[PDB]
Amino acid sequence: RKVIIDDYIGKVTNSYDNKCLLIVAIKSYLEELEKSALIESDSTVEIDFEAQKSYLKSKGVDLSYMTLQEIKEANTGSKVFLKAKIKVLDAMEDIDLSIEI
Amino acid sequence: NMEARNVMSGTWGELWLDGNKVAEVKKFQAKMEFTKEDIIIAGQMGTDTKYMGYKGKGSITLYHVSSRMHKLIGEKIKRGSEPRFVAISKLNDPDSYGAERIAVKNIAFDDLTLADWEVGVKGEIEAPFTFTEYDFLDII
Amino acid sequence: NMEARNVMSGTWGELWLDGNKVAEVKKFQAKMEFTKEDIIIAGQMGTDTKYMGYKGKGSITLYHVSSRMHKLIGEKIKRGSEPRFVAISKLNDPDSYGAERIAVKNIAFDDLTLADWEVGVKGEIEAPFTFTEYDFLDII
Amino acid sequence: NMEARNVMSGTWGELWLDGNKVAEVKKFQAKMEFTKEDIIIAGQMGTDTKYMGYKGKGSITLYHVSSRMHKLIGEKIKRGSEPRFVAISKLNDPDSYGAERIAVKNIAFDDLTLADWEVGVKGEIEAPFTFTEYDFLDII
Amino acid sequence: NMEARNVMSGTWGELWLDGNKVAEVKKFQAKMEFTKEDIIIAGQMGTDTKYMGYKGKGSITLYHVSSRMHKLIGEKIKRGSEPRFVAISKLNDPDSYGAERIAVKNIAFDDLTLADWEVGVKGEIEAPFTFTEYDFLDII
Amino acid sequence: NMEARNVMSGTWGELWLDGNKVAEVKKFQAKMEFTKEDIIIAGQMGTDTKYMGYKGKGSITLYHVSSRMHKLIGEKIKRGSEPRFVAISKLNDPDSYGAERIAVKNIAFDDLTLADWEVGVKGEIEAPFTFTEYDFLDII
Amino acid sequence: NMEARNVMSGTWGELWLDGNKVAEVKKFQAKMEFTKEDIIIAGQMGTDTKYMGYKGKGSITLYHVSSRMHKLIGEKIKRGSEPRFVAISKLNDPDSYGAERIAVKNIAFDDLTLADWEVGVKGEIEAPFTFTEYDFLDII
Amino acid sequence: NMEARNVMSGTWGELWLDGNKVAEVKKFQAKMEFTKEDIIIAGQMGTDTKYMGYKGKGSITLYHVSSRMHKLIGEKIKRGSEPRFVAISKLNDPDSYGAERIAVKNIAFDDLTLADWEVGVKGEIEAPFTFTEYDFLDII
Amino acid sequence: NMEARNVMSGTWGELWLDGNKVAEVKKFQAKMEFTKEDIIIAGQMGTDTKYMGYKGKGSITLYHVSSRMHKLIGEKIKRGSEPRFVAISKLNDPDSYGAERIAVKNIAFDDLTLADWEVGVKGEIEAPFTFTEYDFLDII
């Protein structure tokens, strides 16, 4: 929240390239969090396809003849939609051992 | 599934060099050459190989619209310092399944072309390079 | 017996790579290069050779429909581990006497092509490889 | 004596391999390469040579009607045993003076082609070999 | 921004050699070849290179209007003294963004062509050279 | 100044060999190949070269009107004596600025062609040579 | 059991010297040379040997990134005190099973390279040594 | 941390001899060879060594621009007095961090090259020497 | 100051032997080897040296145009008298500044080559020698 508020709200134009740059910044922050071993190293960030499609449908444009790649970069006004996938580590609390006599 | 329209066309590519989009681009190519050594194992006729590393190579060809390549490295080369660049290639064909983007890092160029022209011939400049690292972005 | 229609056509082939059928295939080629040493035997003018082993080589060329080749080996190559695959080629021409099928094993690829495009030209990707073993399935 | 019609045509040849007639044959070639060493003799400017031996080489190209070449040597090569064959070539043109026949012995092949096909192209298989001995039968 | 007309054409170039304008010029080319050594660093598969220097090469091709090339170096070469020249190339296309000018210094030529003619063919003379230094003047 | 008509044409040349004019001449070419060694000077990236000498090379091609080349050297070569000749080339085009003449001295020929003919093809003989010295006569 | 991939690669090795990691390592080698005295026993033809001791030898080669070796021993050599070090080598190939780590103790170097460079050549330093004792840490 | 660019290049070095800069320097080398005696200690298998002293050796190679070496020592060698010199070497690569400067004192040359030349070969002079003491000035 | 052209070339040298110019000279070399004794001084680690004298060595290589060396020494060697000669070497490169001329006195040859030839190889003669004194004439 602090990173987004400091440098992105109101200072960039809502284009596809700026969205990609913001995605890169978030991914870089997650990779920085990686080295401290707080979460897992499989984190991915990308455009929230379904939310964007729902918003476009609400605005009235027809998506029957729109390519899947075309929907990603279509205009959304001021709104931006993103999604991520991270895995959070936990401490050792249960242990199983089987010694074969 | 497979159809003729799905094949990507090179007219739809674009290239960013050092964060600046290059509009006068003709072709872009990157490749990785693996290093493998032959190993003969007793009792088997077929030879087997062991992989040891890779080497990256490529080139850029672009129309001679402006003297872009000089301003990058011309003065730095004489002094003895070699710069490293980052290139991004995006291939976005409307017919194909989306687009693929790749970042090629640690690029070092092989040569610099001061002047090349001939009467009755349009000008072109091609520059080969070598790299070490790469990323995958929005692969299909 | 022999007739023109009996000759096989390449349009009727197909290729399975790692258990997944590849539809955008242009050509497939496999070969085995024997190793022979010259030996001169006293009293005979004609030189004779001794067979010592074989080496397997081949290549695959396919249309650039999708980024299939990256997902296989791109991340594994950097880490230092080399994967091995299995390919099956089937050639089934209705006019010829049935079909022949061959399995090529222990395939290791020679290079990886990150990007290759040019304005006004359709995209293609060719990848050479080396193998060690093979089977015969439904040979004519 | 000499006339255009007397020239032999390749359409009229035929080839027997291991006692079985091969009907899908495109071309056949055999040759002997002599080995000669330069010798300089005092008092003479012109260099003279001494003949020491010969090496036999050739190749066969045939339409890919059937998987004949595999059944001969495919399984034997892996085990470590090399077979030897005998080929007979006959060239019988009605216009020329009769026919000439030659037997090429102790044939050992150079490589085996598991698969080779491309879309829109007819299949062909070429196999080079080396030999040691030969006979003359009904030479003109 | 990018447009077809912006591409520079070779018809609009001109070349000054030793302070005298050369009007019968067909093409002019200069290039710098960097010297790089492969370095393998423990723990990384990708090979990296170290830049050590550069070598300059080029050539000039011009119509055989007059015996200009002889008067420069013909008598000096025999005596044992090698001259050094300076060349300036200017490429000024009205459609493109202005003009670029480059001075190539310390030029030493590779060969001298005494005579070259053939019946029914116009005469041309091409001379390659090597250089060491360069300046940028009015680069775009 | 510069105009199309000023370019010299090869049809207007002529050649004197050993004081006798050769009328059946197709082309004549002479060149001087300098010898240069790379020298690396501490503190400078650009490599520099040192000139050490030159080598002369050329060739003559002429129609096979008569057996001129045999009578010159055929008997002398076998005995062990090598002759040296002098050639003069004159290029006189009415449109160009006058004519240029050059004498090439100490010519020694590389080979002798005893016979060369083929059915349906006109005969030609080309002879390469090497020289050491030259003069300038009426240079433009 | 035996596969080509199991062979260790030297790119994956790393070296510690006096507890500080040496990233600029090219090659490492440590060897133990036994001492054996010839013994002849009366009544038997075959000559036999007796083992008496061993001597340890080795060498380290590294790029000339910094002046590491000077600070280690240069000042102490002049005074008369000979330092002793400990080296640790680990060879961890991902394809091979297990990594071997060996400690070499009581090292004494043979020489110090104050300065060595040549124009157009990258710098490298190599230093042989002798040791006395070793130790096994997680051998395969 | 470790990068290919950090490797020092010998092109950027320079040498001072007796306070006069030597611009015609090709390569410089200075080495210190220790003296060690084998010591066998009863009760332990491994042989140990004792350090006793060092001997310094080196050489200088330079182009034959002028007769620098003659004026230094030629006259004094005949009389019987052996001069002693001081050499300073600095290696300053812009890509590497820091430049190392070392002074080599009490130099005595091994030989004097009066004359050495061959046709078609550039001239070079090399001279080995031995020294006694060194000094560190701004090591990395 | 330092330029590539300043390097002396061996093609421009010439040699006088016993007052007669030697035009058939291939290479010349004269060297002075010092004699030094190791001296160990108590209290200091570095070994030092003492200079005692010098020995002169050299060789001359020349083409086999004539029998020059026989007439010089052949008859006197049998009788028992050993002749002594004087050689003068001058190296005058037009590009370099100044020419060095050195006289080598009291020459004694090591061997005489009566005959040495092989078929298809040009003849050459080389003869090493030792000298005692030298002299400087117009050193640079």
Author numbering:
A (entry chain V): 254 to 354
B (entry chain M), C (entry chain N), D (entry chain F), E (entry chain A), F (entry chain d), G (entry chain k), ...: 3 to 142
Which statements did the authors publish about this structure?
Here, we report the atomic structures of an engineered diffocin, a contractile syringe-like molecular machine that kills the Gram-positive bacterium Clostridioides difficile. Captured in one pre-contraction and two post-contraction states, each structure fashions six proteins in the bacteria-targeting baseplate, two proteins in the energy-storing trunk, and a collar linking the sheath with the membrane-penetrating tube. Specific attachment of baseplate tail fibers to receptors on the surface of a target bacterial cell triggers conformational changes of the neighboring baseplate, which leads to reorientation of sheath proteins and contraction of the entire sheath assembly. Since the sheath and the tube are anchored together at the opposite end by the collar, collapsing the sheath pushes the tube through the baseplate, driving it to puncture the cell wall and underlying cytoplasmic membrane.
CryoEM data processing of the post-contraction diffocin particles resolved two different substates, an apparent transitional state and a final state, which is 2 nm shorter in length. The four-layer sheath near the collar only contracts partially in the transitional state, allowing for the tube to be extended an additional 2 nm in the final state. In the transitional state, these sheath layers are partially contracted, as indicated by the gradually decreasing diameter of the hexameric sheath rings from L28 to L32. Specifically, the diameter of L28 in the transitional state is similar to that in the final state, while the diameter of L32 in the transitional state is almost identical to that in the pre-contraction state. Consequently, the last few sheath layers still interact with the central tube in the transitional state. The N-terminal domain of the collar subunit binds to the tube, while its C-terminal β-strand extends towards the C-terminal β-hairpin of last sheath, forming a three-β-strand handshake interaction. The insufficient contraction of the sheath and the absence of additional collar-sheath interactions indicate that the transitional state is metastable relative to the final state and has potential for further contraction. However, contraction of the diffocin pauses at collar-proximal sheath layers prior to completion, giving rise to two post-contraction states. The observation that sheath layers on the baseplate side are fully contracted, while those on the collar side are partially contracted, supports the wave-like propagation model from the baseplate to the collar, and our structure of the diffocin in the transitional state provides atomic resolution details of a intermediate of potential relevance to other Gram-positive CISs.
